[PDB]
């Protein structure tokens, strides 16, 4: 379990030992991270089904239960990043996955009983936001296991199939409803399995602006992930959104991967910049798909425009990461050259810096999984329309086009 001699930058070690151990750790890592994305977004599919089983909460109170996980999620991302060098990859993974069985059983009971207070439901949602932090600890872990010049692929895999968890849950939670307990309890066998699997299979080794640009991209993917099924119910109450909502966050994740791959083919800042034009254009065209009370509008268009807003948000996530990655490689190149060192040192140090920075950048970035569905709450509960919220979004994506041109291209 404990590993005292770890030398990934040494090809000879990599070939005898490293690759085998890092590869087994990676493969057990992924399930434990996508399951944390499943548990993170429970209310994105459960708050929709809350009234349909006898819960008289404001639709704003429902958006609130959808927004709160990302409160604790964002705030637990910085401390979780410091937890891997302290307890170790095997132990923390086991622990941080295992303790997700708490809020999963607890809203399997609370949902069946009809007199259960809002107070309890706020707590369960905040404890679901613990699953949100798994990302930063899982991502530090992987950065330790893989050699600096190979971390890209593994990190890409870890968070790529990690983010996929949101989409995977949305495809399952409605399909398992045959009622509202099963959308929570179907994960207790899976969380347990891979806690045991992590416990035995894994190993214990011995710029503010970028936070904003990540926030605008990832924050959007994860924001629209929280309150889309919820929004496409206060707009088109007669369509069964649950059977379609999954496809959104699915495209988002796939877009994240093509994000960086695209970006190193035609410029980090360029893609970011052009894709904030798209994220603005698609924020405006949503205005022209809304029905006003009620109800005269288009759904296919609404859904396609949102499908675009998930694709565009994913693309940006990848785009922003490789901008960070690139910025750090320029900084480290210049410093080393001034110290008079080798490019290898610069490569390694840039890989460490982006990994050290990642805990903080992903913390700020996760704050947008709250604001977005909170804005859809305080737009509805006030003006009785989503037009108020979306007006803020449009201004922001305009601000992000501005703040990218001015500060980069």
């Amino acid at each position, epitope marked *: 379990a404990v*590993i*005292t*001699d770890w*030398r990934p930058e040494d090809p*000879a*070690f990599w*070939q*005898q*030992r490293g690759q*085998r151990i890092a590869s087994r750790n990676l493969w057990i890592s992924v399930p434990c991270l996508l399951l944390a994305f499943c548990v993170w977004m429970l209310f994105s599919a459960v708050a929709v089904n809350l009234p349909k089983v006898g819960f008289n909460f404001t639709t704003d109170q429902l958006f609130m239960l959808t927004a709160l996980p990302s409160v604790s999620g964002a705030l637990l991302r910085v401390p979780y990043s410091f937890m891997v060098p302290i307890f170790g990859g095997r132990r923390w993974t086991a622990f941080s996955t295992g303790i997700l069985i708490i809020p999963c059983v607890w809203l399997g009971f609370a949902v069946q009983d009809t007199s259960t207070p809002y107070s309890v439901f706020i707590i369960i949602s905040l404890l679901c936001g613990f699953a949100g932090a798994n990302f930063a600890s899982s991502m530090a872990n992987i950065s330790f296991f893989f050699p600096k010049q190979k971390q890209g692929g593994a990190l890409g895999l870890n968070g790529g199939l990690g983010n996929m968890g949101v989409s995977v849950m949305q495809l399952v939670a409605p399909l398992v409803v045959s009622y509202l307990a099963n959308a929570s309890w179907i994960w207790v066998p899976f969380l347990a399995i891979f806690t045991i699997a992590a416990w035995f299979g894994m190993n214990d080794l011995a710029l503010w602006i970028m936070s904003l640009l990540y926030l605008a991209t990832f924050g959007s993917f994860i924001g629209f992930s929280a309150g889309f099924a919820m929004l496409s119910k206060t707009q088109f109450p007669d369509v069964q959104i649950l059977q379609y909502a999954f496809f959104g966050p699915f495209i988002g994740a796939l877009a994240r991967s093509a994000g960086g791959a695209l970006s190193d083919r035609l410029g980090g800042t360029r893609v970011t910049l052009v894709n904030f034009i798209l994220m603005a254009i698609f924020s405006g065209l949503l205005f022209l798909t809304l029905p006003t009370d009620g109800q005269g509008g288009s759904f296919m268009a609404f859904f396609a425009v949102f499908l675009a807003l998930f694709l565009t948000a994913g693309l940006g996530s990848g785009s922003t990461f490789q901008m960070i990655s690139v910025i750090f490689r320029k900084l480290t190149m210049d410093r080393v050259k001034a110290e008079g060192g080798s490019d290898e040192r610069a490569m390694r140090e840039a890989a460490t810096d982006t990994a050290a920075a990642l805990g903080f950048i992903s913390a700020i970035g996760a704050i947008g999984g709250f604001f977005i569905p909170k804005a859809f709450g305080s737009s509805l509960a006030l003006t009785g329309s989503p037009v108020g919220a979306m007006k803020v979004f449009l201004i922001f994506y305009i601000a992000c086009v501005v703040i990218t041109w001015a500060v980069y291209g």
Partner: antibody
């Protein structure tokens, strides 16, 4: 039961070649490097080098560059040390031991005595 | 190559007594040190890896410690079985053996 069992003692004349073997069992062979240690009579242990069982690349200590070859046979799950153009100085007991890396040389063969004489 | 010096080269010590073998590397070996026991005719046994971690099976009376260049190894309650030659080895960059310590028990 992890074990490495080595070929028996050999007597050779100056100028000839020996080749000693080491059969590993009780563990997955290609997961661990193999070391070779030399012990001349009344001297201490000398590290000769190691062979990488996942790629067959040998690595020699400054002193064992020339007449020494490590080689592998992955299916036989065994490694070999070949000594060529033998000199009296090669008279020694030779060990194979397992692992360069975490628990370096955590299992040894029983040793193999080579006498270089006329 | 990283050189290893071991003290003492040999010694005789009472039953139930305590041994301290030291090892000084020519440069930093970042805790990568192992200790072997070598009874004659048999083959070496690994006692301690990574400065201070006992191999499983190896009894409590054995331990080591140190860092950087300077490391040591101790047998705490000497027993007749403990009669052997002990070895430090560095496995940081390449590998190097110490010169040995032929331990004799007094009676």
């Amino acid at each position: 039961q992890i074990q490495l069992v080595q070929s028996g003692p050999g007597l050779k004349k100056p100028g000839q070649t020996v080749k000693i073997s080491c059969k590993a069992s009780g563990y997955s062979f290609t997961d661990y490097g193999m070391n070779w240690v030399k012990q001349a009579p009344g001297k201490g242990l000398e590290w000769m080098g190691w062979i990488n069982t996942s790629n067959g690349y040998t690595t020699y200590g400054a002193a064992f560059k020339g007449r020494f070859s490590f080689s592998v046979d992955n299916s036989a799950s065994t490694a070999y040390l070949q000594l060529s153009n033998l000199k009296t100085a090669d008279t020694a007991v030779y060990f194979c031991a397992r692992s360069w890396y975490n628990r370096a040389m955590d299992y040894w063969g029983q040793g193999t005595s080579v006498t270089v004489s006329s | 190559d990283i050189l290893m010096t071991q003290s003492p080269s040999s010694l005789s010590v009472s039953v139930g007594s305590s041994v301290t073998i030291t090892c000084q590397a020519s440069q930093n070996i970042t805790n990568y040190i192992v200790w072997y026991q070598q009874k004659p005719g048999q083959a070496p046994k690994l006692l301690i890896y990574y400065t201070s971690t006992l191999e499983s099976g190896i009894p409590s009376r054995f331990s080591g410690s140190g860092s950087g260049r300077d490391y040591s190894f101790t047998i705490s309650n000497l027993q007749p079985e403990d009669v052997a030659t002990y070895y430090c080895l560095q496995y940081n960059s390449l590998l190097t053996f110490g010169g040995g310590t032929k331990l004799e028990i007094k009676r």
